[PDB]
Amino acid sequence: ETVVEVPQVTWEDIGGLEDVKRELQELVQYPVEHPDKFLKFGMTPSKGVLFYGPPGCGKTLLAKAIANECQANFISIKGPELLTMWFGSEANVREIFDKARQAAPCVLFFDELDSIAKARGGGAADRVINQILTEMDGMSTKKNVFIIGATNRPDIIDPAILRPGRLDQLIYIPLPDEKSRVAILKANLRKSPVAKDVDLEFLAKMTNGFSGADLTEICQRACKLAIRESIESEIPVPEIRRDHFEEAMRFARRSVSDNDIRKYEMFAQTLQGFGSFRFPS
Amino acid sequence: ETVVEVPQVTWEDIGGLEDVKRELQELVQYPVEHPDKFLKFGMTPSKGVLFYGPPGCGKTLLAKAIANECQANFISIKGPELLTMWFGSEANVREIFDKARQAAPCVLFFDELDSIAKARGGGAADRVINQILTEMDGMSTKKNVFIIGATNRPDIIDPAILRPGRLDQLIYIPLPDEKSRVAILKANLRKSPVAKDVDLEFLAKMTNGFSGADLTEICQRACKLAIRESIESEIPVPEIRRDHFEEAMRFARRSVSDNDIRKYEMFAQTLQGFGSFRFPS
Amino acid sequence: ETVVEVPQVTWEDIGGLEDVKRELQELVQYPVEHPDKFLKFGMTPSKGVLFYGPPGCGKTLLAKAIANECQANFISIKGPELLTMWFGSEANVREIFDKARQAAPCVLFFDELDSIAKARGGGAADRVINQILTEMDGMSTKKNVFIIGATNRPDIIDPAILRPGRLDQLIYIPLPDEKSRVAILKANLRKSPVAKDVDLEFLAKMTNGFSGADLTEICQRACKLAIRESIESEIPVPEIRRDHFEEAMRFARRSVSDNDIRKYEMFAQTLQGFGSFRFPS
Amino acid sequence: ETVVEVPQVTWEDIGGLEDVKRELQELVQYPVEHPDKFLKFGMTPSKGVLFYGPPGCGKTLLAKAIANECQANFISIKGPELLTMWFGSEANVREIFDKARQAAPCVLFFDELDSIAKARGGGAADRVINQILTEMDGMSTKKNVFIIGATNRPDIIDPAILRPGRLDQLIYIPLPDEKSRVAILKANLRKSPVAKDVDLEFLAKMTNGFSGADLTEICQRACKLAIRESIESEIPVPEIRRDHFEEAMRFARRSVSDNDIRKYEMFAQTLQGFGSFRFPS
Amino acid sequence: ETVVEVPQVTWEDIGGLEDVKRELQELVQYPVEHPDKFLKFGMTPSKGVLFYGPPGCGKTLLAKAIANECQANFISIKGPELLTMWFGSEANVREIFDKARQAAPCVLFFDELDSIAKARGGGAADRVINQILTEMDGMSTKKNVFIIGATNRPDIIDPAILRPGRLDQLIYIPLPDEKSRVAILKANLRKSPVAKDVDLEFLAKMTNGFSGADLTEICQRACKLAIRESIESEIPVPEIRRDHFEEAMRFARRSVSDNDIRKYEMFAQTLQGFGSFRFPS
Amino acid sequence: ETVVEVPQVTWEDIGGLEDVKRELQELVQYPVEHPDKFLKFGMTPSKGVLFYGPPGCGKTLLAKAIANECQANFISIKGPELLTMWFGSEANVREIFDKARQAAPCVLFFDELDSIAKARGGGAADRVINQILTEMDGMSTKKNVFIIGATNRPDIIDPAILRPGRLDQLIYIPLPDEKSRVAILKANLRKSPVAKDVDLEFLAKMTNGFSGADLTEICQRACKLAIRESIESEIPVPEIRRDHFEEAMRFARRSVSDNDIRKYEMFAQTLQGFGSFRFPS
Ligand SMILES: CCSc1ccccc1NC(=O)C[C@@H](C)N1Cc2ccccc2C1=O
Ligand SMILES: CCSc1ccccc1NC(=O)C[C@@H](C)N1Cc2ccccc2C1=O
Ligand SMILES: CCSc1ccccc1NC(=O)C[C@@H](C)N1Cc2ccccc2C1=O
Ligand SMILES: CCSc1ccccc1NC(=O)C[C@@H](C)N1Cc2ccccc2C1=O
Ligand SMILES: CCSc1ccccc1NC(=O)C[C@@H](C)N1Cc2ccccc2C1=O
Ligand SMILES: CCSc1ccccc1NC(=O)C[C@@H](C)N1Cc2ccccc2C1=O
């Protein structure tokens, strides 16, 4: 069944994205720690955020990290489960939201919620989507239940979701930058024994269009090469030599083509005038 | 379940639209206050109205305001509910109308009733819509039950709905004008503490193509900026200063493009000759 | 449930269409008053007529009037009812026809029976329509039950209906003429108090392309203006003054465009040679 | 060859359109009579106007009338001439513009200048159009040459012509109103002998959707009926009796369907906000 | 024939766009004033620039202004000229380029060179365009001939043009900013007599989505209203009163819809990574 | 007219592509220096090669380099020139080939000969292309004239060209490699004064998907920044500092998207089994 537990991954697992870090902090951590400030100005906190961007950029990791910062429970619903509600039996959504309700500080996370529209392609609408919207509107908003939905194809999302009182804050998660890349390497690589002069900074520099998944795959390949060498030795070397990394590098491949990056950037810009508005004074 | 209660929002929450305000007054308040006038001339009052216009213009607020002026109960059915009856279970419409019937002075309000046609795109027809029409025709019309339906896409509405004995009076709700804009700011902003020389009139003047939702977003952004500043101070300032508003303005965005406004104006004109007809005398 | 009662509307409600009035008289009133004459010549009376023409011309009123002249019970089935049995549950047709059969002098009236085809747009065929055809063929024709079907779009009617033993006599009901217009005004206006120099004949002259619905709307607008004036006076004038009319007239709008009228005329002409046939003598 | 002469038709020929009459007066008559006022404010007069509207509404009559009011020479280029220098030999446009240049107070009039695009249906552009544009831009504008272009289908006009320094003022000429209708009857009927109680005001009232061409056809038919009766008498009655008009009316037909009128109205509305702009004071 | 003169319009006429002003200064001024620095570093100056953006933003004005800064001759070729030598006679391109060659400091300006592609809708290619490319490649580049091409539809431009040795620097000219708007008003209005409390800054604030053409139309309308008032008075007031403006404003319309602005912004972004590249040090 | 001169560019201007360098050496050098070996085996040398690959990779530079190593004359025909023969005048091809024939050791180079097919989008055939084929087949092949054709879109080339006795050897020129990149920088940068610790090796490392044109743009931008700084100083620094480069780099963009690279690789693989064929021995 659903796992409702405080994630252990922290912000340091992705060193970059300080802007969205702060934006998330002020969207979940501020309503919860300082409700007395929110009822001062009569502001109603938002209860929905939509992550969009190219695959393998850390959207799930971002949701887990924000849940960890506020020590809020994390409930994760996957795309296959959404498609099984759709193909089936869509009343399970209500009990999912009830499970979230039981734990007041909950970051409900719908992963690839555009899967229904991907599988359906008649307008953008599915019984599961409408029941999710009904449950979301029904949420009192007094609870600390905060919904996050990650998507790779925001262009096909049903516009009904993008409404006030629902997922309204669209956040763009771009490909990792050099500092974020080295942080993503350090995480997911520190577990393995690495020594010699493996300059993770050099790899961060060289890998430019790579995503988190690509760096994960490259570290995976280096570990596998080390394991193969050690096995051949048995049939020592308790660390991953540089040679392993520089051999695994030439099989490194980028998952997202620059055309997709251009499309995501066009979307982000479309969601972007006055510029310098000043009162008469 | 359905909430059947007299709305508290008033006309002052939307300052403008005096023409449609009077038109609504003579469509709901006149049949109820002065039935003795209606049976004098043998006129049968209309029991249906269709609000159409760009999103976020106050159609729901208008329905609630007219219900408040007559002190009639308000029942609100949302688009997700309509779509779940469609995808489901359309016989719930009958009990919804029964609930409305129990309270004689009732403004039944169907929000985004074009949702079924949006999700369906066969011809313009739906089991839920036809059952709604059956219930509409069956209504005695002696009761004070008055139906209002709000739509953003009247072009795709099934023509079955638009007919005498059904939603016949089509009313256009355009974007707020400057006086309406300042009224919408004063409401939805007066709750929060605002001080200094924030000239809401100046904001009303500057925001020209904005809708009610855009002004709501801008006020919420200003409140959030004030909250962030106060929190940073703690980790005083009991009012939203001008700086907050003039910093939130540069993120202000218009939701309805002028192409959609042109389309709505074209529709309204199409629903618009004799000009000067006089008896022979 | 179904209302089975002799209509009270008479022929004078629509003063024109004397030709189709006589044609209906010889199609319903002749078989019933003088069955002995019909069995003399072995002629089998027709048991079906199809009304077609632009909307709001008085087809339902015509059916009620012919039922009233023969004092035959009137059973009216609406388009929403047909569409719900289609979307549902088509066996209700059998019990509807049974109800008609219980009252021997019955004018069964299917209104907008093209509604199913409109909602369906696969060839011209529907479960409810075929069951109606089965029940219509099964009718003994010894009973005085006589079917009438009103349509706005005869071009999409399933040809299965148009055939001997079914709806075969297609009758064209055009827009009202000036005499018919003044009659349609006097009826539905005489109930209200009208005085001064309201020249209903002048209004009939002016309104040329108008239908019954348009004139009804004009009269209702005049009544509403009078009611508004009287209410404002209270917050006298016990009659609708000529000013009220000549004011409401400038909002008068035609419902049927000239293109639709041209299309209906084309259909009627297509349903229309020998010209002068004579025996050799 | 081209006829360059001051037209004899006047404003009284078409009684209505006082608004566009004044507008044309201030576009042609003011730059010519009072250049000393134009050089005061540095205002550069416009040298182009595009008439658009349903056919047979008096656009050519309006051009001739404005030429007559200013006593400016009138040069008329027809649609067939444009299509022949298109299909042919487009350099003759320069000759035409030179002829206009010779007469300084000239109202150059291009009739149905959309004929090229109608015959062409590749983007909206033809060599003759571009040469007309070249000659129009080359015009000094110090001369008094003022271009007018009448169109029935402004939607297909090449956008290049709708530019500043070219045909920029688009004027909408709707169907005649009652006063305009009676004027259009009096003119083009006064020549013939009409007597008895022919009440042209009654005809103006009756004919509502009619254009100038339709009224001209009515008068033509009445004259033809009178001629036929007189000839039959010979093989007296030197006046057109009311019987002739009342018999010719029943053959009266409208040339422009209300769909086209609605399309023209939608275009005009598209070419129609601030509403109440005021200085801070 | 072609007019080859140093333009008189200056930068002050278009107040804003200081960034592109500097960019143009370093594309035309630096090569001409300081060739001794260009041959020092072996850098070959670019001989082509493409202006793109929404219509009526001052692209022609920008070309004239840059020509005026360097006191270089200005040759302007119009779109109709290009389309006529396309429909014709493309060898005249060589004559034009020879005319430019005669004057060494020349800013050759091709206006709406996308006109041929617009009129053509085969692939993107035209004999005139290819001959222009041939003559452009043939240019020695030792001369001071600098080509500028303005376009409203860069998306349909033949890619042949966009290449090193041709129009390579694509420059985006957006809608005027408030400072640019007030500058555009001050120019084009200062010639006329304006007095009272006409606050051009207030108009600049109010007009937000307006272009240069829209402001020019506003000023022209105000001048025309003043002229009409003065002429009526004659049939004094030698200044345009604030009433004239605040009356002309309500007729003000925006020429470029925000959808087109969004498209241009998306193009500019597409033409817009490393971010922080630094040497190892 | 055509320039027939031995190119001065050498192989060192692109340090990579040693494989294709040797392939070209054995296709032009060997037939020319050692005909006595070709007539020994009866081998008939090929007189045609087709360069294909992404734009801006040095195909023209490769043709010039091979012409330089053999000290053969170089004749370059451009795409615009082909398109003007096409749109015009294809008999000029014969005199071009005659000019080539006059110089026996000639490398005739047709640049972007796919330009005609691009402008044409009817099968792949063009009067100019067929005349080129005729002139190419007719050539004795005893002469030393050798034809090279560069194309960016080999997929749309007319297959008639890809025949024995014509352009037959298709050679793929991919994006520059690391050593090729550093060589392309060293050339095209050595002319300018560069000093400090500008580590061209580091730039070669970092720029991975870049083409020759992209590196040229980087170098030009750095030179332009240096020139601007020197001018501002004057209104010293006789070298391009590291700041100039590392600042120009962030504006660097990749001209060829990885999708195009994938398509070119797919084509190359398609033109790419036995694997290990050995005689029975
Ligand atoms: C927002 C990009 S969504 C996307 C991302 C990766 C892979 C594929 C896609 N979608 C598509 O390719 C569909 C095509 C028709 N586009 C293109 C596009 C560009 C910019 C904005 C919106 C659209 C859109 O709907
Ligand atoms: C009444 C505008 S309804 C609308 C509003 C916002 C966003 C989209 C829409 N519909 C459409 O765009 C469909 C297209 C085909 N149009 C255009 C149009 C203009 C004027 C009248 C009716 C139509 C219509 O059916
Ligand atoms: C009999 C007219 S039925 C009609 C009436 C009002 C509104 C719409 C319609 N149908 C249509 O418009 C469909 C189109 C394709 N037509 C045109 C037509 C003209 C004359 C005869 C038959 C047809 C027919 O099938
Ligand atoms: C401006 C109406 S032009 C017109 C007038 C009479 C007869 C025919 C036409 N054109 C058309 O019918 C073409 C169709 C596709 N429409 C319809 C329309 C309505 C409103 C605005 C622009 C358009 C347009 O381009
Ligand atoms: C660069 C916008 S060009 C433009 C400007 C104003 C008016 C019209 C147009 N072109 C179009 O609308 C054609 C359509 C198919 N689009 C859309 C678009 C958006 C962004 C980038 C390229 C394209 C393109 O080719
Ligand atoms: C050889 C790639 S040619 C190319 C290069 C850059 C930019 C565009 C193009 N052509 C195309 O895109 C046309 C499309 C339909 N493809 C795709 C493709 C892939 C692999 C082999 C042949 C084809 C082909 O004909």
UniProtKB/Swiss-Prot annotation, chains A, B, C, D, E, F:
<feature type="modified residue" description="N6-acetyllysine">
    <location>
        <position position="263"/>
    </location>
</feature>
<feature type="binding site">
    <location>
        <begin position="56"/>
        <end position="61"/>
    </location>
    <ligand>
        <name>ATP 2</name>
    </ligand>
</feature>
<feature type="modified residue" description="N6-acetyllysine; alternate">
    <location>
        <position position="196"/>
    </location>
</feature>
<feature type="modified residue" description="N6-succinyllysine; alternate">
    <location>
        <position position="196"/>
    </location>
</feature>
<feature type="modified residue" description="Phosphoserine">
    <location>
        <position position="276"/>
    </location>
</feature>
<comment type="function">
    <text>Necessary for the fragmentation of Golgi stacks during mitosis and for their reassembly after mitosis. Involved in the formation of the transitional endoplasmic reticulum (tER). The transfer of membranes from the endoplasmic reticulum to the Golgi apparatus occurs via 50-70 nm transition vesicles which derive from part-rough, part-smooth transitional elements of the endoplasmic reticulum (tER). Vesicle budding from the tER is an ATP-dependent process.</text>
</comment>
<feature type="modified residue" description="Phosphoserine">
    <location>
        <position position="281"/>
    </location>
</feature>
<comment type="subunit">
    <text>Homohexamer. Forms a ring-shaped particle of 12.5 nm diameter, that displays 6-fold radial symmetry. Part of a ternary complex containing STX5A, NSFL1C and VCP. NSFL1C forms a homotrimer that binds to one end of a VCP homohexamer. The complex binds to membranes enriched in phosphatidylethanolamine-containing lipids and promotes Golgi membrane fusion. Binds to a heterodimer of NPLOC4 and UFD1, binding to this heterodimer inhibits Golgi-membrane fusion. Interaction with VCIP135 leads to dissociation of the complex via ATP hydrolysis by VCP.</text>
</comment>
<feature type="modified residue" description="Phosphoserine">
    <location>
        <position position="230"/>
    </location>
</feature>
<feature type="modified residue" description="N6-acetyllysine">
    <location>
        <position position="37"/>
    </location>
</feature>
<feature type="modified residue" description="N6-acetyllysine">
    <location>
        <position position="40"/>
    </location>
</feature>
<comment type="similarity">
    <text>Belongs to the AAA ATPase family.</text>
</comment>
<protein>
    <recommendedName>
        <fullName>Transitional endoplasmic reticulum ATPase</fullName>
    </recommendedName>
</protein>
